[PDB]
Enzyme design. Structure first.
Site, PDB file in Angstrom:
ATOM      1  N   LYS A   1      -0.446  14.339   2.541  1.00  0.00           N
ATOM      2  CA  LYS A   1      -1.757  14.548   1.990  1.00  0.00           C
ATOM      3  C   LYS A   1      -1.951  16.040   1.752  1.00  0.00           C
ATOM      4  CE  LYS A   1      -4.380  10.472   3.345  1.00  0.00           C
ATOM      5  NZ  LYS A   1      -3.845   9.531   2.369  1.00  0.00           N
TER       6      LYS A   1
ATOM      7  N   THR B   1      -8.910   6.109  -1.936  1.00  0.00           N
ATOM      8  CA  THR B   1     -10.159   5.492  -2.250  1.00  0.00           C
ATOM      9  C   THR B   1     -11.248   6.549  -2.012  1.00  0.00           C
ATOM     10  OG1 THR B   1     -10.443   3.154  -2.186  1.00  0.00           O
ATOM     11  CG2 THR B   1     -10.839   4.257  -0.069  1.00  0.00           C
TER      12      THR B   1
ATOM     13  N   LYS C   1      -9.912  13.137   5.131  1.00  0.00           N
ATOM     14  CA  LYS C   1      -8.998  12.027   4.982  1.00  0.00           C
ATOM     15  C   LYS C   1      -8.109  12.149   6.207  1.00  0.00           C
ATOM     16  CE  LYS C   1      -7.698  13.841   1.130  1.00  0.00           C
ATOM     17  NZ  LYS C   1      -7.900  12.690   0.283  1.00  0.00           N
ATOM     18  N   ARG C   2      -7.172  11.230   6.457  1.00  0.00           N
ATOM     19  CA  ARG C   2      -6.367  11.278   7.664  1.00  0.00           C
ATOM     20  C   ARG C   2      -5.393  12.440   7.519  1.00  0.00           C
ATOM     21  NH1 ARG C   2      -3.058   6.204   5.329  1.00  0.00           N
ATOM     22  NH2 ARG C   2      -0.863   6.446   6.102  1.00  0.00           N
TER      23      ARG C   2
ATOM     24  N   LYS D   1     -15.148   7.768  -4.030  1.00  0.00           N
ATOM     25  CA  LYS D   1     -16.405   7.983  -3.369  1.00  0.00           C
ATOM     26  C   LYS D   1     -16.978   9.291  -3.831  1.00  0.00           C
ATOM     27  CE  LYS D   1     -14.609   5.696   0.703  1.00  0.00           C
ATOM     28  NZ  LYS D   1     -13.969   5.593   1.934  1.00  0.00           N
TER      29      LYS D   1
ATOM     30  N   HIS E   1       0.766  -1.217   0.000  1.00  0.00           N
ATOM     31  CA  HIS E   1       0.000   0.000   0.000  1.00  0.00           C
ATOM     32  C   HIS E   1       0.807   1.283   0.000  1.00  0.00           C
ATOM     33  CE1 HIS E   1      -3.894  -1.947   0.935  1.00  0.00           C
ATOM     34  NE2 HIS E   1      -3.072  -2.811   1.464  1.00  0.00           N
TER      35      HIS E   1
HETATM   36  C1  LIG Z   1      -2.436   3.067   3.176  1.00  0.00           C
HETATM   37  C2  LIG Z   1      -3.570   3.588   2.307  1.00  0.00           C
HETATM   38  O1  LIG Z   1      -4.466   4.421   3.123  1.00  0.00           O
HETATM   39  P1  LIG Z   1      -4.722   5.996   3.284  1.00  0.00           P
HETATM   40  O2  LIG Z   1      -5.761   6.532   2.207  1.00  0.00           O
HETATM   41  O3  LIG Z   1      -5.322   6.221   4.747  1.00  0.00           O
HETATM   42  O4  LIG Z   1      -3.350   6.781   3.120  1.00  0.00           O
HETATM   43  O5  LIG Z   1      -4.290   2.440   1.731  1.00  0.00           O
HETATM   44  C3  LIG Z   1      -5.405   2.775   0.832  1.00  0.00           C
HETATM   45  C4  LIG Z   1      -5.997   1.490   0.270  1.00  0.00           C
HETATM   46  O6  LIG Z   1      -4.981   0.741  -0.484  1.00  0.00           O
HETATM   47  C5  LIG Z   1      -4.898   3.669  -0.295  1.00  0.00           C
HETATM   48  O7  LIG Z   1      -6.023   4.088  -1.139  1.00  0.00           O
HETATM   49  C6  LIG Z   1      -4.216   4.896   0.292  1.00  0.00           C
HETATM   50  O8  LIG Z   1      -3.719   5.753  -0.792  1.00  0.00           O
HETATM   51  C7  LIG Z   1      -3.052   4.469   1.177  1.00  0.00           C
HETATM   52  O9  LIG Z   1      -2.396   5.656   1.733  1.00  0.00           O
HETATM   53  C1  LIG Z   2     -12.942   6.456   2.023  1.00  0.00           C
HETATM   54  C2  LIG Z   2     -12.428   6.658   3.425  1.00  0.00           C
HETATM   55  C3  LIG Z   2     -11.091   6.911   3.613  1.00  0.00           C
HETATM   56  C4  LIG Z   2     -10.159   6.971   2.428  1.00  0.00           C
HETATM   57  O1  LIG Z   2      -9.726   8.304   2.134  1.00  0.00           O
HETATM   58  P1  LIG Z   2      -8.292   8.589   1.508  1.00  0.00           P
HETATM   59  O2  LIG Z   2      -8.175  10.054   1.307  1.00  0.00           O
HETATM   60  O3  LIG Z   2      -8.125   7.724   0.342  1.00  0.00           O
HETATM   61  O4  LIG Z   2      -7.214   8.215   2.590  1.00  0.00           O
HETATM   62  C5  LIG Z   2     -10.609   7.124   4.873  1.00  0.00           C
HETATM   63  N1  LIG Z   2     -11.426   7.131   5.964  1.00  0.00           N
HETATM   64  C6  LIG Z   2     -12.771   6.926   5.775  1.00  0.00           C
HETATM   65  C7  LIG Z   2     -13.669   7.165   6.941  1.00  0.00           C
HETATM   66  C8  LIG Z   2     -13.277   6.648   4.523  1.00  0.00           C
HETATM   67  O5  LIG Z   2     -14.574   6.186   4.409  1.00  0.00           O
END
Ligand SMILES: C[C@]1(OP(=O)(O)O)O[C@H](CO)[C@@H](O)[C@H](O)[C@H]1O
Ligand SMILES: *Cc1c(COP(=O)(O)O)cnc(C)c1O
Ligand SMILES: OC[C@H]1O[C@H](O[C@H]2[C@H](O)[C@@H](O)[C@@H](O[C@H]3[C@H](O)[C@@H](O)[C@@H](O[C@H]4[C@H](O)[C@@H](O)[C@@H](O[C@H]5[C@H](O)[C@@H](O)[C@@H](O)O[C@@H]5CO)O[C@@H]4CO)O[C@@H]3CO)O[C@@H]2CO)[C@H](O)[C@@H](O)[C@@H]1O
Ligand SMILES: OC[C@H]1O[C@H](O[C@H]2[C@H](O)[C@@H](O)[C@@H](O[C@H]3[C@H](O)[C@@H](O)[C@@H](O[C@H]4[C@H](O)[C@@H](O)[C@@H](O[C@H]5[C@H](O)[C@@H](O)[C@@H](O)O[C@@H]5CO)O[C@@H]4CO)O[C@@H]3CO)O[C@@H]2CO)[C@H](O)[C@@H](O)[C@@H]1O
Ligand SMILES: Nc1ncnc2c1ncn2[C@@H]1O[C@H](COP(=O)(O)O)[C@@H](O)[C@H]1O
Ligand SMILES: Nc1ncnc2c1ncn2[C@@H]1O[C@H](COP(=O)(O)O)[C@@H](O)[C@H]1O
Ligand SMILES: Nc1ncnc2c1ncn2[C@@H]1O[C@H](COP(=O)(O)O)[C@@H](O)[C@H]1O
Ligand SMILES: Nc1ncnc2c1ncn2[C@@H]1O[C@H](COP(=O)(O)O)[C@@H](O)[C@H]1O
Ligand SMILES: C[C@]1(OP(=O)(O)O)O[C@H](CO)[C@@H](O)[C@H](O)[C@H]1O
Ligand SMILES: *Cc1c(COP(=O)(O)O)cnc(C)c1O
EC number: 2.4.1.1
Lengths: 828, 828
Positions: B561, B663, B555-556, B667, B364
């Site tokens: 980011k 992801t 997002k986190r 959405k 990932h």
């Molecule tokens: C670790 C991580 O989470 P996050 O979105 O929290 O940073 O896994 C997700 C699912 O493979 C990815 O879409 C994302 O880019 C990646 O950073």
């Molecule tokens: C979809 C979703 C994410 C994914 O967001 P990214 O910007 O791809 O890290 C994270 N947290 C929650 C609550 C979500 O439903």
């Protein structure tokens, strides 16, 4: 058996919902359901028929607003619930039929339920029998206690030594409780007391939340179902990560556990005090959470709209009665004062009269080691406001005394609630007598003794307060449920009314001369012995002879209970046999069993002695069937339900003046066992009821012990003038029972010889001669069973229904009802 | 809405069992039931209609013996289950009707369910979307993870600072899981390795037991219900009081907790590694317990009687596939070898080919800080056998390398699984590539990068292993459940087949010119904004202007980011306004929100910056409605379900080359939001699908970053030639946003100025100009919505159904089915 009806329609509904729960609640399939899964399926189907009633009983108390009784205990020795629920709800034979048409054998399923052993021994069983009798007399009673995650340990013997394992009783779930997270209450610990302006404020406290879990307590066939509310500790979600609480977030979350540890385990001291802070935390936790629930119902019922007084607690004792079960909840008295004075702002004197009139204290032991004196330094720390209040109580109490006994300075010394000297401590018993309106012992002899010896001072200040209420046992679990054979044969002759009116058992006096009744009585006895003898080898390994006198002492191992004297009886017998080996002697399977508190060196040693004896004796070929000594591993309520129906002799041998009542007593008197015992606790009243002649009374009585103590008990006198005792003591000392470690039992020989408080050797000669009288009578089947009938016919007074009817009338002021409450449920 | 049917008979059964559970399961009465109690009553009535199916799906897999897929993740970010279960089971409109005839409003009840936030962010949500898509394609898949007692913390802002509180999610119960104590498995920790004769024996280990809890995963309208099995740690009942373990019995029992602490909380690091032993204990605990359950099904199905080979694992990869979700379960590779070699006694080489053919690893992130290298000293201690096996693996792996690249000593250096030097550690990613047969990145750009940069060596040794599988989202929760309005209007035009065939969404291209469709699309958008705007003030306090561009980045919080760049956009805007205050500008409600891992100083600071900005901006009277900046407190799956339907602009601004996929992306592309983003992660493919022209692409692409890094990124260059940026940096430095603590944001100015890895300032000019293009287009309602339609029509490829259909075919070798399984249940 009339275990009730068995009835085509109900049989069909029961099958149907057994299957609804197998599928929907257990999410299991017949193809893969184990017996455990069937037990859950059945438990949960019985549970369903009790909910309508539960909900209706509480709705009903809500609108009918009675005086509620809250029984506070830190132990509730429940046992298994299923069969009992079926008994009290009349479902037993409907289900037996249904489970057979499903193909299952109900009794295999009953053995899969694990005991709720939230208790050590008689103190907690009392509470559970009390619970059943309060429901059967339709009293609005609630029993409040702690939901321990681990109850009393499971005893396992390895090498003849007790190995204690944790009782993971909630491991597979508990289909009886209903968690109630909606009613979590906070409990405060530590803090400081800011006295400013209006009064004192307990400020800066740590919060533990108490989360309630309710269990139903069904009355026998009368449709009342009351509630047992057990608290769980939960750590606050905020402060365990709030303040500027850095430490490590992850550690903060791992630290929640420390607060939850208040409900993690029951303290296994089988009444004996332990000054441990986590115990004090338990005792306060119960009281604080419970009293909020008490105040909460008071303020909401019908005072719910009683408007303009302020809010007033004048009526609190006419609506609340709380029963303190031993001193373990005495903080209800300073906590009730804390709430009333500090929080509802009542005048201390008013609040005190409401407190005394609400509280009542039951004292269970005269033995000093069991009494709780908490160190004032610990109280200062954990509960500072309550120390203040206790100090003020004490003050005013002693000023009352001064005025009544002008100049008796030592009275003030004796009676203070604070025990001065070196580690100043607070005597819980004195707290309880000072702030309760009734104080009772549990057997008449224990109450006379409380009035003469330990609380004589309090008796002289307030004679009016001291009462007695002999203990009792519930005929449902202790007759109907563990011994349906005897209950059937009794019922054929005199009907079924006796299960909620045990005194009717004495019409059985008309059958002491009935030959059919004698045959019957003895037949249920031999069958029960056979069922137990089989249990014994199918779950352990045994070959006992079933036509022996089953001589058994099952109770917590302790020196005042004197298992040692019984040990001395056994090798006297083994040795008598061993010297003139071809003499006929009546065979005895002596079973002795009970748990010993971890740490009580002597009790752990006594257990090894019994197994040591059994090792020798049971493999001597010159004995043969004649003696079997077996130690019954892991005693608890479900073993009591199997061994007391099979027992012939009931051993109740406390040095007169130490057992308060004893409740095991009573269980063997119904179930047809004959008692050998001293005049102690309730053995006195059981012998008055059945008559001296139908009891095997030996031993010194109380005076004789006190005479001996003033002389100087000297065990050497005994040793020297009794040869049999001298041979035993020598065998013990030489390593006759410990071949490879001779040294081993010298510890017990030492206490016997030199500092035995319970005077084992002074009762020995009588003990042994009295035991020869028991074998004399066992050789004549017909008159043993007639003695047995006179014992059974007479145990009516030992029903807890009587005891609670007395607590009710002479202390709580509520009248019993056998009037059935109407509850089915809804159906619309 | 076609949310399905609504049907008189089913409405009547539903009402009836709602009431059966209120009474019988909740033991509550209508007179005292709170909305929580009604939520439980309803949850438990929906649950009942899924059991038949669950039981039938597993019975069915048992006899039909397919290759099962086990998805191992340490996170599963489930969210709320109720509505989703109703969606996938078609019960939604039956219940809505029933709850209204009971009088309840279903949507109030849905808000009482607490999220199962067993996840941090996108990694765990992926797993949950995967779960739904494996059930919808009827694959025999199981997701195995840990049942954490506390999931990701709840973020609370106090003073603009994140205050983290524990997520006591199981506090009131979880009506979805089914505890399965019948299948508890032991897991061994520590121990020593005795190599004697036959092989090595892991001996003297501490045992923790893993207790399974199953949750159902219903496929959309196809009657398959699969299982999510989450383990709980339980301390052994014996050893915690066995040995000659004296310590204190009572302490022994209190010490159970330490072993149970393995499942107490999720580690809140939002991918970033933490070498903490309790994390390693979690990761091993999952793997060991799960693999026993895997071996157990293999040996029992149909090999259940396949007699005389020995027992043989040749067929293990044709019957088992386990998917490693990031390296957090890489110990499945040494544990699978440990079981096969040491316990089933296979020859190491045979066991290894079965292992490689079972395992597959999904990578990932490219960000180094997130990669796990466990210290070999910790591995030695806790898991000594697994260290041996890893060493042997490494050996043979490197010997394969030597032979292929004769003489390239540095290759051996780079590729070893053991990172030498100072604290020798073991690179988990290398373990995974060495023992898996397929390794995939989650977006095509992230897979090209994995092949060029970090795993280039492994690519060159085994090119064949490297694959890509772009992430996806499940249209059920992310369209049907959070945005039924849009799903209704889409359905009126093109039918409902698209919910299990999202690619059909592109027939909506025929409606980009349809004026009714444009009106409709924009209407659902404005309604959704109104529902969110109201949420905002009814649960917090707000007055936002609903006709703003809702510009949102949720997002986190992390620096790659780049929430900071968005922060820089906001005060540029506030300041542009502030200088020529009577210029029209399109109003924006900028909402930014997400959790920050505790400890990540910078992320905690960034959060304070946003609230600081909002404090100023939102109370400047010269701005008025024109800008609202709001920080969305406590983001999680249920807030995502409310804010993404209401959003206009989707902020996806990672420095190109850091986001793997993203992801959240996807959405917002359904739900009709337009993306402003860089060419990073999956934004690349979303722009290929909708076309460059329908996307607001700005920023440097990957090469440009690498060009800049080889030059030397120097932020001073930016500062000096851009006046707006210079004013911002000065405001930050002077304390314009921190009036009373000017000093405060200098930390962030310092990183921006001097050591900003993510090159915020190099993308700023493009960012801002691109943002002026977004406001240009928002002023023309009709063409924004047409762009929106082309985005929506094109998101079909981002369904996780496609992703799993690819995992299935190109890695697990199983074919998808949309064939419905027949399940009702029994009825006899
Ligand atoms: C670790 C991580 O989470 P996050 O979105 O929290 O940073 O896994 C997700 C699912 O493979 C990815 O879409 C994302 O880019 C990646 O950073
Ligand atoms: C979809 C979703 C994410 C994914 O967001 P990214 O910007 O791809 O890290 C994270 N947290 C929650 C609550 C979500 O439903
Ligand atoms: O506003 C009311 C009152 O408040 C404050 O009084 C409090 C005291 O300050 C506080 O220390 C506490 O007093 C305790 C005392 O600490 C405790 O030891 C105990 O005192 C008893 C002795 O235990 C008891 O033995 C006996 O002492 C006699 C003994 O009877 C006699 O037989 C012989 O052996 O000599 C002994 C020495 O005199 O009696 C005393 C009490 O008279 O109990 C005390 C009261 O609980 O609590 C006080 C109450 O709040 C203020 O200090 C006071 O000025 C205020 O009037
Ligand atoms: O029965 C088989 C085998 O068993 C035993 O071998 C084991 C070793 O005893 C044990 O210590 C362990 O070996 C590890 C080693 O500890 C670890 O550091 C790692 O070794 C790598 C280096 O990490 C790697 O950098 C590279 O070293 C080169 C480097 O490639 C090169 O670029 C340059 O910078 O110089 C370095 C110094 O040589 O390669 C080595 C390995 O060649 O990995 C090792 C293997 O996992 O595990 C061994 C396997 O069980 C017995 O000791 C052995 O005699 C038996 O044949
Ligand atoms: N506010 C109320 N209105 C009507 N009935 C109530 C009310 N409060 C309590 N009761 C009822 O009396 C019961 C006993 O509750 P409790 O007082 O908590 O033991 C409840 O379960 C209700 O049926
Ligand atoms: N080590 C100790 N731990 C707990 N109770 C003890 C301990 N020593 C003495 N007591 C107790 O005092 C009693 C008599 O035990 P003993 O000292 O063996 O005669 C029992 O009620 C014991 O539980
Ligand atoms: N011993 C067996 N005989 C018949 N069915 C079985 C057997 N073992 C497992 N199954 C079934 O297949 C299911 C799936 O179980 P599992 O293998 O634990 O996932 C069970 O719940 C049963 O319905
Ligand atoms: N005190 C620390 N605790 C945990 N992570 C840290 C710590 N210091 C740096 N890191 C991390 O390194 C990253 C960048 O943070 P920073 O050091 O503020 O630039 C994040 O992924 C952090 O979680
Ligand atoms: C403390 C105690 O329990 P136990 O039987 O375990 O010793 O309370 C029981 C109930 O009041 C009494 O019958 C008993 O004599 C007394 O000793
Ligand atoms: C009845 C009972 C007791 C009471 O026995 P005593 O000898 O009075 O202490 C103790 N434990 C259990 C399991 C009992 O059922």
């Amino acid at each position: 058996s009339v275990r009730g009806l068995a009835g085509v329609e109900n049989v069909t509904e029961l099958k149907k919902n057994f299957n609804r729960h197998l599928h929907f609640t257990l999410v299991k399939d017949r193809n893969v359901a184990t017996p455990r899964d069937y037990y859950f399926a059945l438990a949960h189907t019985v549970r369903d028929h009790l909910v309508g009633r539960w909900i209706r009983t509480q709705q009903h108390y809500y609108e009918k607003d009675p005086k509620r009784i809250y029984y506070l205990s830190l132990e509730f020795y429940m046992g298994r619930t299923l069969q009992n629920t079926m008994v009290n709800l009349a479902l037993e034979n409907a289900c037996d039929e249904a489970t057979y048409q499903l193909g299952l054998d109900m009794e295999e399923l009953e053995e899969i339920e694990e005991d709720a052993g939230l208790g050590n021994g008689g103190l907690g069983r009392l509470a559970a029998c009390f619970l059943d009798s309060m429901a059967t007399l339709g009293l609005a009673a609630y029993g409040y206690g702690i939901r321990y995650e681990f109850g009393i340990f499971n005893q396992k013997i390895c090498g003849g030594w007790q190995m204690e394992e944790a009782d993971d009783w909630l491991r597979y779930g508990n289909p009886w409780e209903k968690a109630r997270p909606e009613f979590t209450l906070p409990v405060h610990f530590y803090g400081r007391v800011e006295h400013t302006s209006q009064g004192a404020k307990w400020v800066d406290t740590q919060v533990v939340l108490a989360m309630p879990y309710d269990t139903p307590v069904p009355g026998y066939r009368n449709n009342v179902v009351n509630t047992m509310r057990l608290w769980s500790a939960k750590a606050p979600n905020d402060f365990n990560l709030k303040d500027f609480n850095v430490g490590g977030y992850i550690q903060a979350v791992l630290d929640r556990n420390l607060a939850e540890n208040i409900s993690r385990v029951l303290y296994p001291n089988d009444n004996f005090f332990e000054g441990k802070e986590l115990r004090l935390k338990q005792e306060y936790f119960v009281v604080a959470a419970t009293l909020q629930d008490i105040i909460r119902r008071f303020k909401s019922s019908k005072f719910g709209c009683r408007d303009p007084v302020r809010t007033n607690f004048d009526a609190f004792p006419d609506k609340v009665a709380i029963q303190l079960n031993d001193t373990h909840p005495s903080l209800a008295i300073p906590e009730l004062m804390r709430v009333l004075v500090d929080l509802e702002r009542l005048d201390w004197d008013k609040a005190w009269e409401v407190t005394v009139k609400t509280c009542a204290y039951t004292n269970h032991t005269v033995i000093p080691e069991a009494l709780e004196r908490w160190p004032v330094h610990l109280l200062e720390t954990l509960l500072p406001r309550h120390l203040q209040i206790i100090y003020e109580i004490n003050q005013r109490f002693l000023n009352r005394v001064a005025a009544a006994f002008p100049g008796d300075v030592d009275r003030l010394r004796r009676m203070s609630l604070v025990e001065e000297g070196a580690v100043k401590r607070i005597n819980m018993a004195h707290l309880c007598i000072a702030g309760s309106h009734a104080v009772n012992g549990v057997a008449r002899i224990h109450s006379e003794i409380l009035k003469k010896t330990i609380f004589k001072d309090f008796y002289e200040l307030e004679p009016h307060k001291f009462q007695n209420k002999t203990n009792g046992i519930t005929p449902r679990r202790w007759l109907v449920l563990c011994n349906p054979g005897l209950a059937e044969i009794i019922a054929e002759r005199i009907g079924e009314e006796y299960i909620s009116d045990l005194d009717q058992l004495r019409k059985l006096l008309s059958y002491v001369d009935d030959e059919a009744f004698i045959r019957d009585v003895a037949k249920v006895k031999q069958e029960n012995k056979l069922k137990f003898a089989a249990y014994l080898e199918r779950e352990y390994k045994v070959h006992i002879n079933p036509n022996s006198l089953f001589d058994v002492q099952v109770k917590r191992i302790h020196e005042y209970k004197r298992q040692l004297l019984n040990c001395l009886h056994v090798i006297t017998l083994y040795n008598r046999i061993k010297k003139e080996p071809n003499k006929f002697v009546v065979p005895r399977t002596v079973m002795i069993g009970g748990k010993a508190a971890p740490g009580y060196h002597m009790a752990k040693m006594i257990i090894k002695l019994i197994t040591a004896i059994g090792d020798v004796v049971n493999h001597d070929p010159v004995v043969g069937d004649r003696l079997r000594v077996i130690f019954l591993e892991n005693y608890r309520v479900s073993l009591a339900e199997k061994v007391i129906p099979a027992a012939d002799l009931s051993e109740q041998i406390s040095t007169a003046g130490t057992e308060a009542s004893g409740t095991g007593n009573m269980k063997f008197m119904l179930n047809g066992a004959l008692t050998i015992g001293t005049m102690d606790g309730a053995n006195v009243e059981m012998a008055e009821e059945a008559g001296e002649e139908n009891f095997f009374i030996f031993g010194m009585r109380v005076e004789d012990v006190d005479r001996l103590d003033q002389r100087g008990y000297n065990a050497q006198e005994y040793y020297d003038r009794i040869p049999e005792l001298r041979q035993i003591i020598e065998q013990l000392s030489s390593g006759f029972f410990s071949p490879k470690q001779p040294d081993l039992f010298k510890d017990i020989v030492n206490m016997l010889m030199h500092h035995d408080r319970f005077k084992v050797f002074a009762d020995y000669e009588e003990y042994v001669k009295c035991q020869e009288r028991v074998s004399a009578l066992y050789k004549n089947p017909r008159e043993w069973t007639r003695m047995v009938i006179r014992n059974i016919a007479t145990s009516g007074k030992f029903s807890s229904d009587r005891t609670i009817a007395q607590y009710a009338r002479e202390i709580w002021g509520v009248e019993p009802s056998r009037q059935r409450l109407p509850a089915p449920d809804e159906k619309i």
